[PDB]
Amino acid sequence: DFAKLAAAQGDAIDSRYHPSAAVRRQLNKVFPTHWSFLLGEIALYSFIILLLTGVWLTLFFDPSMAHVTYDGVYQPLRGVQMSRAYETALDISFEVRGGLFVRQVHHWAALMFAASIMVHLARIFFTGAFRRPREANWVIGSLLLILAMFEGFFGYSLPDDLLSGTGIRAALSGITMGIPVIGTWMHWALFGGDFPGEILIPRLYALHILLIPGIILALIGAHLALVWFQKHTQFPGPGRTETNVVGVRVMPVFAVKSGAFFAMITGVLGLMGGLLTINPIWNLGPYKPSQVSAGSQPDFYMMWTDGLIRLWPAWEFYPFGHTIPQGVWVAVGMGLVFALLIAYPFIEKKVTGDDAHHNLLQRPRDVPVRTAIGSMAIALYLLLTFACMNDIIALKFHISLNATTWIGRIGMVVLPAIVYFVAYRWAISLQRSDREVLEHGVETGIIKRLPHGAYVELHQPLGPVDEHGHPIPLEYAGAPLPKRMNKLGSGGAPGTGSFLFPDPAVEHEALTEAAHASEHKSLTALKEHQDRI
Amino acid sequence: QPTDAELAEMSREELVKLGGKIDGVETIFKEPRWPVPGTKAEKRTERLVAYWLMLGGLSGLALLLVFLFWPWEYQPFGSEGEFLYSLATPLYGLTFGLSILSIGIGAVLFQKKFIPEEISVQDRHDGRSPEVHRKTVAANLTDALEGSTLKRRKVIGLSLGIGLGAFGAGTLVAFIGGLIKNPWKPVVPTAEGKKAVLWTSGWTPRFKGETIYLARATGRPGESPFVKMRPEDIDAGGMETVFPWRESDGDGTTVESEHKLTEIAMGVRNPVMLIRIKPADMHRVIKRKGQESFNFGELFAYTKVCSHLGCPSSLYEQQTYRILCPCHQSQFDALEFAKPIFGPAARALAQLPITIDEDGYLVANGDFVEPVGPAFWERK
């Protein structure tokens, strides 16, 4: 019945499309199981949730700048003039059952999408996963991050509330028009005239629901296809070489783990959507150029840019009756940052001279200069991000606002230098900590007094020993070293049973023996594969 | 490469191993999770997985039941239903998020406790492809190009390059041309002819001697959103936002008046801060050149638009006389012609000249003498 049906459908599919060999190649593909290789798929799942909830939102949203009088249920805004966009954003959150939940899941998913992209980028950079043959795919990811930043910005600009409209007036309108020679032409091409105009929100809506997400989808497809057919990197370890992939096959283990991780990410984003308020636009009011509120932060992934605006000094030039205003610096700065991010693999292969194929990753401690540089970059990013929140920090943490500006200004130079130096020394220090275990074995923490009164700590050797009993020094192999005896199995196991009642002793004995035999067989399999290759 | 009768005599395990070998994959370790049968620990673990999946099912049913029957509609402030309404979206998120969260946990546990533990090794076969494939694909492409004879027909090659270039150029220009707009096209009627938008605002006179009142927002939409203002309406230490209003703009009862007042409210270079200096502080006022008579006694009027990037710079500290912009923390000295003293702003806020008319209402005494708002390449 259920088996004959599967065989019949399988034969029908195979006689018509003969996919057996290609499907089997997909089922046998091996992926490494490292926890940090799951960071990219948080971004993928966030993007999928964004697509689903965004499609739901487009069924109710009218992105018009046409001014109307609010006639809905939210009493504190009755009679207030607003755009159709603000109108329908309110209608979603009050007049459609589940609309507020969908809207909040969309916005939380956008935040998790940007944050996931950042953390996954950090893994790629610090482990060296960008090196050849994978330079292009770092470039594709860099473009994906830029597109995600601007997509999220356009998305939260759509409701045309006071806060987001203030963000549009300063960043999208002010910086753009400040651009030299072509600034005002770019402004009038984008807005159709002066700010705010009547075309901006419908145009941003078209960019946000179709055009930018289509480019993102195409780039994500290229990205995942490159990963799939270039065969994911791995960390050094037992049995791992430059020419193999150690891990699990797709069918069934990796497929089950991916599906379960997708379900758990969805659960977290769903709990956030209905437990934490995000962007309650009815409290902000519709956008009016005469109004503003304290605390005009953008979403976090834009804050650094805003932070840069806050920190850069009022340096302007007035050549021959023209004006180059302060915001131009910020624009140039952004370009520079992006250009340095896209170009990093080629910069590093030019500096280091290393142009070899690489499939084995580097532990971040073992590349101290790149780790120091990335730590320096993260320090600058965090300083600019917190500079953007300097007014909130001043209010909550009792710091002068002027002082926060100057702390950001000086720290923008000093903090990355300090962080670079500290991260460099810390990475080399971890290298020395690994060396110590390699020469002496694992410190067990057990102190012993010898008969003549010496105090010695017992060590657990990781390899062969002498006739004197000291271990032979082992060579570093790019892989982590154990430093706790409990992580080597010294603690044993409690004893089989439920939490409150023991199982029969014979069951416990059989289970423990089977577990030890299985662990030994797995170690032996990896060892003999390593010995053979 | 076995045969059809050798395949029929293979067990599943040998077939799995052969399929892996064809694909370049060897499973070097593979063991069932429970080699000893009939153990209480196995039944306990089975029940643990089932418990997580059952929690997922119950919470999914709870999502169904709360979405149908929880009171979801907005309730106003201080009403009896406001508290239950405030839990609707939280309950949606709790029942949805828990459900799929519990199913994911249960599936993770099933993989970790019941699906066999596995180590598999795949050969990469990466780098340059075998020489046969490189040579044959290169021969294919080179034969296509050289066989076509396109390289030795230079009139055709040049014509194709020029024609494709011209078509692409024309198509690109026609595709983006509709977006391009001259920002300096004169479109705004003023007392001395049409002017470009950025040089003007609601304070630009439309004819010589036009009376433009400093109007204040009543906050009631329609029904006179803007009214005239008198100098005694503001105390020393007070600040009010005023807008450029004309008698002909009306009270917003008609449709045309309403559209005019909407254009007043939405004009980005319109809002003005009117401050009244304390008379004891008038000796500390420094005037800007060309603006020495722009104040009506102790009343000063500056643009509310920040000169840095256009935010409403409206945090007016009456004792320090400091105008703070909330966006990027620029600070302007109201006593020294709104000159910037902190932040990214390099330019002072424009001063509006003000006076009173015969009825004693505050009116503008002309236009700004410089462009208002953020700077641009073309300015000054």
Binding site: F317 | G209, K287, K289, S293, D357, E358
Partner: peptide
């Protein structure tokens, strides 16, 4: 650089004249 069209003055200034206002919108 400093904006060339922004300088302090020492001239005191006069009280503005009452606004009269021309006709013909």
């Amino acid at each position: 650089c400093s904006p060339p069209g922004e300088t302090a003055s020492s001239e005191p200034g006069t009280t503005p004249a009452i606004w009269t206002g021309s006709p013909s919108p």
